[PDB]
Design a protein around this ligand. Structure first.
Ligand code: A2G
Ligand code: CA
Ligand code: CA
Ligand code: CA
Length: 129
């Protein structure tokens, strides 16, 4: 029951961009498709997303812009699945662009990193059947 060009996996529909956007723009894009930036809650979902994105930095629906880490659909962060690269998240200021790092993304090996929300990365939308 997914729209055309979306991939079905375990009762969810996924859309994989092939262009980049800043996190806020990617978030708005997903909402306009009645969807949300991907929310990863299991190792099997993590492996499925990794297969389709390949070795490319790609935004997910996890951020700490207003305080603590939150998933865009209200899924609890603390008790949920996490796949940070060791030493991440680190809220790095050293990029010199202003502020720390408030948006999560998959890195080239699948492990997560927090980075500057303005960066243009590919993104994934998800909707639940
Ligand atoms: C893309 C990526 O992994 N970026 C990270 C950045 O977010 C920050 O953690 C930095 C710390 O030295 O290490 C990397 O450059
Ligand atoms: Ca999900
Ligand atoms: Ca942060
Ligand atoms: Ca980081």
């Amino acid at each position: 029951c997914c729209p055309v060009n979306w991939v079905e996996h375990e009762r969810s529909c996924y859309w994989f961009s092939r262009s980049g956007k800043a996190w806020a723009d990617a978030d708005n894009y997903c909402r306009l498709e009645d969807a949300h930036l991907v929310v990863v809650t299991s190792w099997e979902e993590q492996k499925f997303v990794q297969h389709h994105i390949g070795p490319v930095n790609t935004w997910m629906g996890l951020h700490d812009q207003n305080g603590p880490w939150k998933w865009v659909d209200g899924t609890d962060y603390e008790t949920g699945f996490k796949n940070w690269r060791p030493e991440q998240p680190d809220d790095w200021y050293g990029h010199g662009l202003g502020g720390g790092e408030d948006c999560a993304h998959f890195t080239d090996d699948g492990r997560w990193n927090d980075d500057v929300c303005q960066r243009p990365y590919r993104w994934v939308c998800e909707t639940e059947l």
